Amino acid sequence: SGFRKMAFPSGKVEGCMVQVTCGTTTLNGLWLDDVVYCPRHVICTSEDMLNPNYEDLLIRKSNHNFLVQAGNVQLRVIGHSMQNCVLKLKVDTANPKTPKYKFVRIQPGQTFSVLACYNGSPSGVYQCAMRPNFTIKGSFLNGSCGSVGFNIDYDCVSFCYMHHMELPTGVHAGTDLEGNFYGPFVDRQTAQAAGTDTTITVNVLAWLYAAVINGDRWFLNRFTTTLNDFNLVAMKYNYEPLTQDHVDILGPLSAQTGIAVLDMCASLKELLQNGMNGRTILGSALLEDEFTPFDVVRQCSGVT
Amino acid sequence: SGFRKMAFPSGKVEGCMVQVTCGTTTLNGLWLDDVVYCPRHVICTSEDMLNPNYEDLLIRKSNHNFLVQAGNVQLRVIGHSMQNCVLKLKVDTANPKTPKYKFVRIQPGQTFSVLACYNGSPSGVYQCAMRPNFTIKGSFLNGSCGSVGFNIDYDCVSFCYMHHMELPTGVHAGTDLEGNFYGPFVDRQTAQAAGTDTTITVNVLAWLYAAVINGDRWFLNRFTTTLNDFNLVAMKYNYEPLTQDHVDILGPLSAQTGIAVLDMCASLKELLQNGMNGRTILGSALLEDEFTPFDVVRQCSGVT
Ligand SMILES: COc1ccccc1OCCNC(=O)c1cc(=O)[nH]c2cccc(OC)c12
Ligand SMILES: COc1ccccc1OCCNC(=O)c1cc(=O)[nH]c2cccc(OC)c12
Numbered sequence: 001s002g003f004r005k006m007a008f009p010s011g012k013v014e015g016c017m018v019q020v021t022c023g024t025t026t027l028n029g030l031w032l033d034d035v036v037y038c039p040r041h042v043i044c045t046s047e048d049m050l051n052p053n054y055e056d057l058l059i060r061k062s063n064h065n066f067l068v069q070a071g072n073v074q075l076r077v078i079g080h081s082m083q084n085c086v087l088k089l090k091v092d093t094a095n096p097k098t099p100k101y102k103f104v105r106i107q108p109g110q111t112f113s114v115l116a117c118y119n120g121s122p123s124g125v126y127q128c129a130m131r132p133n134f135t136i137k138g139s140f141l142n143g144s145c146g147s148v149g150f151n152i153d154y155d156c157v158s159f160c161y162m163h164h165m166e167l168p169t170g171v172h173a174g175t176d177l178e179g180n181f182y183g184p185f186v187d188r189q190t191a192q193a194a195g196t197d198t199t200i201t202v203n204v205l206a207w208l209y210a211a212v213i214n215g216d217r218w219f220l221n222r223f224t225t226t227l228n229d230f231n232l233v234a235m236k237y238n239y240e241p242l243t244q245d246h247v248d249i250l251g252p253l254s255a256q257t258g259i260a261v262l263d264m265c266a267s268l269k270e271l272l273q274n275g276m277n278g279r280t281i282l283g284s285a286l287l288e289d290e291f292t293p294f295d296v297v298r299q300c301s302g303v304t
Numbered sequence: 305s306g307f308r309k310m311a312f313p314s315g316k317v318e319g320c321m322v323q324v325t326c327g328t329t330t331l332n333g334l335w336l337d338d339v340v341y342c343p344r345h346v347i348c349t350s351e352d353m354l355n356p357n358y359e360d361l362l363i364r365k366s367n368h369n370f371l372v373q374a375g376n377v378q379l380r381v382i383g384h385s386m387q388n389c390v391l392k393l394k395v396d397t398a399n400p401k402t403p404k405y406k407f408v409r410i411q412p413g414q415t416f417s418v419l420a421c422y423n424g425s426p427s428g429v430y431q432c433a434m435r436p437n438f439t440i441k442g443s444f445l446n447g448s449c450g451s452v453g454f455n456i457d458y459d460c461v462s463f464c465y466m467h468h469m470e471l472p473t474g475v476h477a478g479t480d481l482e483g484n485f486y487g488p489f490v491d492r493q494t495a496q497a498a499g500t501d502t503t504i505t506v507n508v509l510a511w512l513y514a515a516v517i518n519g520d521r522w523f524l525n526r527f528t529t530t531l532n533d534f535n536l537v538a539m540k541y542n543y544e545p546l547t548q549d550h551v552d553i554l555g556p557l558s559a560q561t562g563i564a565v566l567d568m569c570a571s572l573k574e575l576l577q578n579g580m581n582g583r584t585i586l587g588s589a590l591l592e593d594e595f596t597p598f599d600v601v602r603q604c605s606g607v608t
Binding site for chain 2: 001002003004005006007008009010011012014015115116117118119121122123124125126128137138139140141142143144166170171172214215275276278280283284285286298299300301302303304
């Protein structure tokens with residue numbers, strides 16, 4: 001028993017982190033096979049960030065201007081190309097620690113682990129979720145760009161995020177491993193504001209199932225509701241609308257606990273309408289929305 | 305900016321996890337040099353757990369009864385000995401992935417990362433704290449015993465915890481790497497209850513400094529207090545008494561923010577007396593006590 005914000009083991013990803021320097025800027029890169037992936041803003045000076053023309057900036061760069069270091073050994077760059085907002089630095093050596101991998105673009109509401117890095121060295125690992133407004137609430141300082149987000153399926157690392165920037169609001173923006181930003185964000189130091197940060201309803205419900213499985217049942221009530229009635233309440237509290245697909249995905253948690261999805265929805269409805277009254281659920285005083293139904297099942301079953 | 309419950313990268317520890325089987329029981333072991341460390345309750349049947357005599361149980365065991373597997377390869381056991389509540393299985397091969405390590409016994413209030421494992425395979429990593437009642441609020445299922453707690457100092461892994469059991473209350477008990485339990489717990493399936501779980505005051509204050517550093521300042525007030533006045537309030541809310549050593553340790557956070565430790569104590573006092581009024585601090589609706597002053601400085605400075 002017990003329920004923690006758990007990240008995937010980071011070893012397979014640690015073996016891919018490298019340092020990429022271009023001019024005076026040093027950030028992180030991801031070394032997979034004979035390619036190093038990094039944010040293209042590595043080629044910018046802090047002055048350039050206000051309005052950079054990356055194609056023009058890239059013309060002044062050659063293979064030898066990109067310094068790639070894995071541990072204390074320098075990698076030889078034999079090619080460079082821009083794919084959307086990432087640079088792909090072709091190196092002459094394939095990473096001997098390359099795990100089985102995939103590049104996946106995630107949907108809002110999905111979760112992933114972040115291995116925060118500075119100067120190509122891992123400093124920590126934590127669990128995140130892609131917010132419905134396509135930001136992530138990470139923990140990143142200067143030098144963290146190029147840190148990646150990932151999921152692990154047994155021995156296969158699915159890379160889903162690469163860190164690019166912090167918005168003036170302190171939230172984080174980035175791309176998938178093909179260089180496309182999540183959301184409307186651009187790699188420019190400009191007025192960019194995130195939209196409404198709505199609560200991931202399907203994740204909150206999954207976390208209520210985890211609480212029931214772990215013994216916290218005070219919030220269970222004698223009521224039920226309908227998808228339409230529940231969503232009237234969800235909209236008022238800036239919660240994502242619950243769909244029949246979400247009910248279906250919550251199916252195995254409903255089967256495990258014997259509590260119907262709509263019954264759990266009515267408990268959530270009352271928690272939204274009346275608050276927690278000074279009580280806690282899984283050691284938290286608010287409704288947690290950064291555990292998907294898959295994370296709850298995985299944590300409550302022991303998937304290694 | 306941003307503040308997350310961050311665990312250390314787990315790679316160095318993943319390379320030490322092995323599976324140890326004795327009879328029908330399989331748990332995790334820690335392979336360092338030519339020794340595999342595991343809970344001694346590996347030699348027990350579920351019947352034995354009610355009142356095991358480990359010396360008598362160990363007499364019936366030989367080197368060949370302890371099956372040690374690292375990945376898909378079997379390790380040859382050439383020795384076995386009991387040190388307090390851990391077994392030390394001498395293997396004929398030194399772990400080639402052994403990192404620089406130390407065995408340290410931690411104080412209550414200190415934090416560490418846990419790499420939860422099942423069948424010698426890592427499933428997840430999370431951050432924990434040794435509670436003042438010597439329990440940890442982990443996330444562990446059947447098969448997780450032998451999972452370890454650790455801290456990392458650059459390239460040196462300081463092992464501090466080995467998981468042994470879950471108390472009837474759902475909290476977790478375990479030992480240091482020399483086999484001595486944290487707290488009064490014994491490796492017996494018996495009526496064992498944890499004492500009062502007090503709040504680690506020095507950690508809450510450090511997390512209030514992290515909140516100020518990250519922009520959350522609503523709780524800052526026009527008041528100050530004294531160590532004695534603060535502790536009168538701390539005792540009433542089952543908070544650990546704040547000492548001059550704690551004030552000293554909070555020194556660099558006080559210097560960084562310009563907020564005196566006693567001023568932060570008065571803000572905490574008002575938060576205890578009046579609650580958060582529906583507001584949040586670092587995305588939390590309660591006072592977080594599982595970040596030491598060192599964790600806050602590390603996370604807010606970028607220690608890799
Ligand atoms: C506005 O900056 C950019 C705009 C578009 C594209 C890139 C931009 O930044 C590049 C450098 N960013 C970081 O290293 C940075 C990332 C982060 O998540 N947190 C920080 C916290 C404090 C200071 C920081 O940088 C000085 C960071
Ligand atoms: C009362 O048991 C013991 C007493 C003393 C010493 C050892 C005891 O347990 C040995 C086996 N323990 C685990 O594998 C176990 C550990 C854990 O933290 N959570 C669980 C959650 C559900 C089921 C579980 O085991 C069947 C566990």
